[PDB]
Amino acid sequence: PLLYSTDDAICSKANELLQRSRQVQNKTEKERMLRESLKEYQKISNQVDLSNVCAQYRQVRFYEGVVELSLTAAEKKDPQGLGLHFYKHGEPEEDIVGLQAFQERLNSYKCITDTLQELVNQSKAAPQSPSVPKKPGPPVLSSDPNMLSNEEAGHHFEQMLKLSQRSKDELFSIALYNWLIQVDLADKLLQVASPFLEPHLVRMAKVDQNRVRYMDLLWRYYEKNRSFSNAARVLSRLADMHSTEISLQQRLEYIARAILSAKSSTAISSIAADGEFLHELEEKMEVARIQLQIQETLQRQYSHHSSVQDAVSQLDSELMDITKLYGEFADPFKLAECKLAIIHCAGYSDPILVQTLWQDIIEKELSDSVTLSSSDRMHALSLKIVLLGKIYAGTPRFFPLDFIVQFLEQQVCTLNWDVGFVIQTMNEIGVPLPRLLEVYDQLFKSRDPFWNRMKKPLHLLDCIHVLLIRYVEN
User: Fold this and answer.
1) Measured between alpha carbons, how far is 301 from 28 in angstroms, rounded to an integer?
2) Distance of alpha carbon 290 from alpha carbon 284, whole angstroms
């Protein structure tokens, strides 16, 4: 009906590919004339609709058409920098207007993957010599030159890669890679190190939801540099600030970083930002290990089989906001050792508080031991106390003898054992020996109930005398 299209976006390319098959081979005939025709006689083709025309373009290996026509496309898509702030502005689509020009960009992305698969693959014969109906897309492999110039695809690779490495702008680099680099067998983005890789990586990291998909890549690819001894440089970026909560991986990181932890080493310039932060991380590491020990006990309890009804009233509200929450509050199993452990881990200074925690701990261990003790209640007590005194480096004001001693004398009173052995438990916990003398002299005055029955003066003085002369702190 007189219909006539002066400029054609795809018909020209379709016809030209028909001629490429029948008249002009891209690699061996009229390559420069084909480029020039591509720009000036196929300038109208510029933007090509992913269609049958593109399917017949796939069988030939030419790609200078892809890159330059895409340039003219970004010309006919972004007239004056529309693309630059498209990503650069960042997630405004939440409306009918935002998801508008994504069309044919997502199509070029999915299509690129389709092209990657079909172009990389082989013909019917190459995967299977005999040929049944042929899938459109795979390159045919027949009557290839005697010389091993048959494998054009290899330099096709080299060419397209140069295209990636070399461009006036970033248009065919960053823009057409969305559904190609996040699919199998893509090595261009990793090999290239553009000065814009890092900013896109930080932008992806900013959103936790976006970050998780790229998280393993996010740490490495984000940093061009080895980042040899980065500690909390990705940790600030790391989401949920999850240092002491899960403890099924936090300790894995703690050990795999602490068998290299270098404190006072001057590895990183900002002590306040890295040294101070990693110091807090070390405190948190103690927190996580201790809380994890709480978890392991409560989880493998036989007396407490399932843990369905108690743990979630604690976990759902705060999983691990603060250590003392679970250390002093969130332990239905009634652990008190955790309470004083977090009073040392999280410093609190009440003689009455510290003292009561001591009594609560002693009563907890004796009660558990009667229910279950390896040998002698005192021996189980020794197990627990060395465990506590090893994880916690002793603080001189935070480990007063006066507090422990009354309960130790209570234990000697209740459970009769060799006098040298209670001395061995306290001695092996590292308890101050000067304060041992001072406490055992203050306490002796007035014959306090704890020191009654005079079990030690029997042979303790002489045993400790000989023990000391041969050896210290014994």
Assistant:
1) 77
2) 10
Report in angstroms the alpha-carbon separations of 195 from 44, 174, 288.
Answer: 34, 11, 39
The experimental method, as deposited, was cryo-EM
The answer to whether residues 180 and 160 touch, using CB atoms and an 8 Å cutoff, is: no
Question: What's the Cα-to-Cα distance from 318 to each of 70, 184, 192, 324, rounded to whole Å?
Answer: 52, 40, 44, 12
257: tokens are 């970083």
The CA distance from 298 to 282, in Å, is: 24
The candidate with the shortest Cα–Cα distance to 86, out of 70, 75, 100, 71, is 100
Task: Count CB-CB contacts under 10 A for residue 223.
Answer: 15
**Rounded Cα gap, residues 104 and 85, in angstroms:** 18
Q: How far apart are CA 305 and CA 169, in angstroms?
A: 64
For the chain, the first-to-last Cα distance in angstroms comes to: 112
With both helix axes pointing from N to C terminus, report the angle between 419-428 and 460-470 in degrees, rounded to the nearest 10.
Answer: 50
Sequence-separated (6 or more) residues with CB below 8 Å from residue 267: 229
Burial of 174-213, coded b for 16+ CB within 10 Å and e otherwise, reads bbbbbbbeeeeeeebbeeeeeeebeeebeebbeeeeebee
DSSP code string of 271-314: IIIIIHHHHHHHHHHHHHHHHHHHHHHHHT-SSS---HHHHHHH
- Written as six digits, the tokens of 362 are 């002693």
Rounded Cα–Cα distance for residues 74 and 438 (Å): 85
Give this entry's resolution in angstroms: 5.3
Q: Tell me which residue of 191, 167, 189, 171 sits closest to 180, measured CA to CA.
A: 189
C-alpha–C-alpha distance, residues 108 and 433, integer Å: 78
CA separation for the pair 173, 155 (Å, rounded): 19
Name residue, tokens 């452990």.
341
Name the DSSP class of 182. Answer: T
DSSP helix/strand/coil, 362:
helix
* Residue whose C-alpha is closest to residue 47's, from 13, 63, 70: 70
CA dihedral 103, 105, 111, 115 (to 10 degrees): 160
Contacts for 115 with CB less than 8 Å, ≥ 6 apart: 58, 137
Are the C-beta atoms of 234 and 247 separated by less than 8 Å? no
User: Tokens standing for 254?
Assistant: 């703690």
Task: Name the amino acid, one letter, at 139.
Answer: P
Question: Tokens in use for 125?
Answer: 């014969």
d(CA 364, CA 336): 7
